[PDB]
Ligand binder design. Structure first.
Ligand code: HEM
Ligand code: HEM
Ligand code: HEM
Ligand SMILES: CCCCCCCCCCCCCCCC(=O)O
Ligand SMILES: CCCCCCCCCCCCCCCC(=O)O
Ligand SMILES: CCCCCCCCCCCCCCCC(=O)O
Lengths: 415, 415, 416, 104
């Protein structure tokens, strides 16, 4: 009873597990429409793609994030009742706290700490037979994130803290044991950080003004009250965990360098401009965030479709980032496409669209870019290495997707 | 005043632990009364026995089940706040859900799956030195129950899941370590099944209409709302666990065939009619459910006893099944006593009395009988085996009870 | 307001309290020449005091309350959540009478005698062992005796685990990091273990005996006649079992005192119960255990030219008061003879609290602690001879609680 | 007879001391108490050092050898595994005693 296409399959959630990052795109292509209806994740939903749909998706008067996604994502990736599900001035108030910790001075400090760690790892890498970049990245990022945040990290817990952080990320689009590893990792990380929050509030743990642990421990909401120690820990996890999740992008950028070697000498000849272009294309080209979920706040009409209050809407991030209407040859890795490109908040949304200060767009975008640029500079200039025979293939069905090998490296030598 | 027999001892709960299935009958015999007063399980109680008392016990205007038993039974056998403690229209509404899953077609299906599994196990049994029927029964029943319910069950977890189910059953009448194993097994099973409920509601787990997992996940109460995912998991476990608990009756059936071999050829020359009589006598003769607890809902007088509102009342299941006024030679195993016998809902109550549709009587009675008939048919026609030297003794003080050896078999060969 | 009252203005005072421990308050009362100073401690603006006169005001229940006084960390490790230590008013007195009813002189005598038989039985094994750690031996014996006297079943294969969980809770009350987390994990294990007992008892499924701690906690009724929650009843029973095991600290300090002051061995041997009580009291006064106590100002009042505002945190220095030269001549010296002909006072000797135990929060186990210490000291003096080999007997005044590092390891043990 | 008397008197002291522990226990298995007491008494009388944290495992190893002499299968294999552990544990004592590094 509508001109809006309707997928009437009742197993669509299971097909989403089968198709992953291509579920919405396969159907927007099939139905010749930027939007279609489908029962997904237990809700009658509308899936939409494209920059114009992203513009509507980020209209906070038309869309809310509360109760948008199933509880399984909060219990694994986000944390229960955290910022991802907040709306109104309360969300903006808490969003300002996250943004205050991810300013360019923070981005520069984090990238510089990573540069030091990469250079120091060379002396052990030269003595190893093989090195898995994903494993080295997750442990370096965990060590750097905690140090930069004032979070104590003993050397005997680095691997278990980093694995717990990655287990949460690796579980957001999974069922069965991969999803359960994140469900068990989250309570350990929350208990671990909440103790620091309580010790800090009693003065029994030294904190430093301007760092994430201190600002989370002593942040006050709009009513002047502090966050519950568990919520303060959860929101600190929403800083430490995604910094470790940069490991995925670091492996993808290394895979892109390997699969497209002409950009290797192109990066050496250039400077930070060419590294940023490469890093932006890594974020646009490779999969990470599949889609975003929202609920319709008030009845409205857009693109000849009636959005009723309460219906779930999913915005295809991967499809928008591979839209031929916005990107020429979208399925090709071409860093040159970002040369002299005007800033657009809705055609490139691997970490969200719109304004971070007025919406749910990722505030760690700058940190992600600067850490990637520094890690790319290290791979290009500091060391030479072989990429031995391995399964470099990554599955689009799997969410999040990662090359099975993890970019194993051998024959590592300093330049 | 009452002037009804009164056991004035203060350690009666400890005496119930040492006398078990005979505690109520020892005192009804001693007091020459169908009922007596006593302080049991921390409550001033009245124990009663006989079919007439069973008729009164199942008057839902006179009796309720809410708050009738200590919390220890919920936290081990039943689950907290499940069907066993419900009253009124809400209980009948949930009771219809269970009954819809245990109709004769379900009984036939479960019995047929059991036959197929028994026959396949012969190849393994012929190669083994000894086989413990109890351990084989619980694992087969667990795999058959989960497959029939639509509950996924990996081969690497069949033993643990079946052990967790049996631990809950083996703990309902225990104190100390035996009871604690059921207190620890219950949260494991609830968490295991609850994940399935939430995954099914999100469409991420395939379910099939008419199976237990589906019907529990999408059952709606009187107000049209579905159960909490934990409640739905608890009530699904109230289907899976008692199916595994049939292992007790299967072991007792083999013990009856061994201790009274005159019935082996009697069953051989007979058919389903003789298997019914044998299976029914196994349920009447051997102990399983000791007694049932209820609370007096309103003041009433029965058998010259004034039942005050709120007092605890225990109905002797075991003693009623061995009542010489209802069964000739009640302490003898005589399957022929069920030859062309009319339906009586209160003289034979090993799995409750009254109407299962209008009360708390076990809805799995038909499933239990049909699975027992199939397993008995298998032991009689399909294999020959030795019963080596073992302790086949079972204690009437241990609740639940089981032959100590578990009817270990050897020399197994197909026929 | 209180600009005259001295004021430590450091922002890291909670961290300095961790590194100074039992000496944090005395260092500043000596520094400021005052029984009173202000400081931000444990996340609250506080006033620290010391001396017998300060203790008198601290135990004025109209001026001070215990609810919300300490951080929740102490409840989650030592006390238990919402237990007797944080209660005020008639409800506190009611539950306090329950504890006192289990720690009367008949209970003190029973526990002390149970200790004596266990010490004597241990000699047979001690003679066959190369070395014996008194701290490890005490906590096991104290746990076995406390559970037996309380009616708490204790399997032989769980004695070490239960005793370790009790000490983990005690050893964590003044710590941060791993040492504190051990108590944070031990408490749920102990609470769950005891709560099943409370549930089985209330159902008649576990035998209890009137007059024993397990029975009295399981069937204690509040002012409104209702029973405690099964979890709360277990928590308060642990507030009896655990502190009995905690006597292991005092037992090691007593043996440390005999070794470090050998002249009192013959003094005790040539004496009787009088000299043992004097030695035991001096062990409690001289050695550290209870650092300070916390309370909230119940209502506005003025004392010692200081304005106490309702809600402000106040910490009473137990250690410093016990070493106050105004009350004890040569206070930093172990002199058991100082307790001969000592007038009984409720505010100058406060290692386990001050005031009246029946009208305040003073430790009701003081009598049990003394009687068990006397019997243990009697055994160490008359029953056995032993060597104290080379070991680290040092105990840090910054570590809360404190213990000689070795735990007074003994060797060459033989009967007398 | 002097060695017999000494071992019996050591046993007597151990039985008497055990009563304090037995009075607080719900149950006591005589076989398990006898094997541990005998192991401690035998080692002490022999001059063999025996830490309290190893009494159970040393006594278990001793009984495993005895309980295996007329058995086949797992019961016999327990003794076949306990013997190398006990032989190695005692040969180190012989080694140290002959070097004067263990008091005898
Ligand atoms: C590895 C690279 C990253 C990717 C692909 C990514 C992606 C995303 C996506 C898709 C969202 C949801 C956006 C929305 O709802 O509109 C998000 C939100 C968020 N991200 Fe990231 N992110 C990354 C790195 C980071 C880092 C390193 C941090 C922390 C320093 C971070 C912090 C956050 C926070 C706090 C939010 C919630 C923002 C809010 O709800 O207002 N992210 N991110
Ligand atoms: C092994 C044989 C079994 C025995 C001895 C047994 C016995 C009992 C007893 C004594 C009750 C309590 C009756 C009452 O309160 O009046 C009961 C209830 C119940 N049984 Fe069974 N049962 C058996 C098998 C099963 C099986 C195989 C299932 C599931 C397929 C099952 C499902 C239930 C349920 C759902 C209830 C609760 C009914 C209600 O409260 O309305 N039982 N059973
Ligand atoms: C025999 C073992 C012990 C038992 C059963 C015991 C019991 C208790 C109880 C029940 C309380 C709470 C009283 C209240 O809040 O009203 C308490 C408080 C206290 N106990 Fe003990 N105790 C024992 C040994 C000790 C020892 C050896 C010390 C030495 C450090 C000690 C020091 C304290 C302190 C400082 C308080 C707090 C006093 C206050 O808040 O005013 N106790 N004890
Ligand atoms: C099939 C399950 C449904 C899929 C749920 C998708 C969850 C949307 C959020 C994805 C954000 C990307 C995560 C990057 C790492 C981080 O920021 O923690
Ligand atoms: C300590 C006294 C016992 C407490 C009262 C026991 C009441 C429960 C009786 C239920 C018998 C049937 C249990 C087997 C089937 C199942 O798994 O549910
Ligand atoms: C940050 C320092 C903690 C504050 C001090 C908390 C209470 C100190 C006094 C209690 C000492 C009692 C310890 C032995 C008895 C017991 O086990 O309760």
């Amino acid at each position: 009873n509508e001109q809006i296409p309707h997928d009437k399959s009742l197993d669509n959630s299971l097909t989403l597990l089968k198709e992953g990052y291509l579920f919405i795109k396969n159907r927007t292509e099939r139905y010749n429409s930027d939007l279609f209806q489908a029962r997904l994740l237990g809700k009658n939903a509308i899936c939409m793609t494209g920059a114009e749909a992203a513009k509507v998706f980020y209209d906070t008067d038309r869309f809310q994030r509360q109760n948008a996604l199933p509880k399984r994502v909060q219990k694994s990736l986000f944390g229960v009742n955290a910022i991802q599900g907040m709306d109104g001035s309360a969300h903006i108030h808490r969003k300002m706290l996250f943004l205050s910790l991810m300013t360019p001075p923070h981005q520069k400090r984090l990238a510089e700490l990573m540069t030091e760690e990469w250079k120091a790892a060379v002396t052990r890498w030269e003595k190893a037979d093989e090195v898995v970049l994903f494993e080295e990245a997750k442990e370096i990022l965990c060590r750097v994130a905690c140090y930069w945040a004032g979070v104590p990290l003993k050397e005997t817990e680095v691997k278990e803290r980093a694995d717990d952080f990655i287990d949460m990320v690796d579980a957001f689009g999974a069922v069965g044991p991969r999803h359960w590893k994140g469900r068990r990792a989250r309570p350990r990380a929350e208990e671990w950080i909440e103790v620091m929050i309580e010790d800090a509030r009693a003065g029994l743990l030294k904190t430093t003004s301007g760092t994430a642990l201190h600002e989370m421990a002593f942040h006050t909401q709009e009513d002047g009250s502090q966050l519950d120690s568990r919520m303060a820990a959860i929101e600190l996890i929403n800083v430490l965990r995604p910094i470790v999740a940069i490991s995925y992008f670091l492996v993808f950028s290394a895979l892109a360098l390997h699969e497209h070697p002409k950009y290797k000498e192109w990066l050496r000849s250039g400077n930070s401009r060419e590294r940023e272009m490469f890093v932006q294309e890594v974020r646009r080209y490779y999969p990470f965030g599949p889609f975003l979920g929202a609920l319709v706040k008030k009845d409205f009409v857009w693109n000849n479709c009636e959005f009723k209050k309460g219906t779930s809407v999913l915005l295809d991030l991967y499809g928008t980032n591979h839209d031929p209407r916005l990107w020429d040859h979208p399925d090709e890795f071409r860093p040159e496409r970002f040369a002299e490109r005007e800033e657009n908040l809705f055609d490139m949304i691997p970490q969200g669209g719109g304004h971070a200060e007025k919406g749910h767009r990722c505030p760690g975008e700058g940190i992600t870019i600067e850490v990637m640029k520094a890690s790319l500079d290290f791979l290009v200039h500091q060391i030479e290495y072989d990429v031995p025979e391995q399964s470099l293939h990554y599955s689009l069905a799997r969410m999040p997707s990662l090359p099975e090998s993890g970019f194993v490296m051998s024959g590592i030598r300093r330049k």
